[PDB]
Amino acid sequence: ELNNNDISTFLKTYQTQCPSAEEVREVVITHLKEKEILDNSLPSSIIIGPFYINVDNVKQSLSKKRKALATSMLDILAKNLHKEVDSICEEFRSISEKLVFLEERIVKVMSDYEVMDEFFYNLTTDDFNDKWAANNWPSKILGQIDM
């Protein structure tokens, strides 16, 4: 079932569900633990009666399918972050307290992804540069507020 219920089926189901990104992470980390479960449980090879059996191809196919699923969930979570970051930057552009609350939003979602995995975070160079530009944007906002 884990082989047949492919990446597409769960990825579409999850992302149309679009759950709360931290809880989505909590399931992806459950699936990463499922990788660990597989890697401990599965042999490379086993001997059965007159037969020599190998299971390497299923072990790797299942594990790399699980990796592709977890990382694609992380990817769509990154796109939802990018949707927030784009709305935040669009507000900074448009007005250039809500702007400060949008700083709070970007900082919050970045901090969430940082907390739930350091390796999940730094999702793009664009995310680092948008975080720094999001810090720069308040100085511009205040400069334009003088007008």
Partner: protein, 39 residues
Amino acid sequence: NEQKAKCEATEKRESERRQVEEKKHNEEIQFLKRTNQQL
């Protein structure tokens, strides 16, 4: 003969374990590498 075969089996077992730890080390490094370079 059996003790030689057993010793061989032990060194095979340990070299397998070493490979498992090697690949763990490799992906751990790859995690650090990707996050460090991504800045």
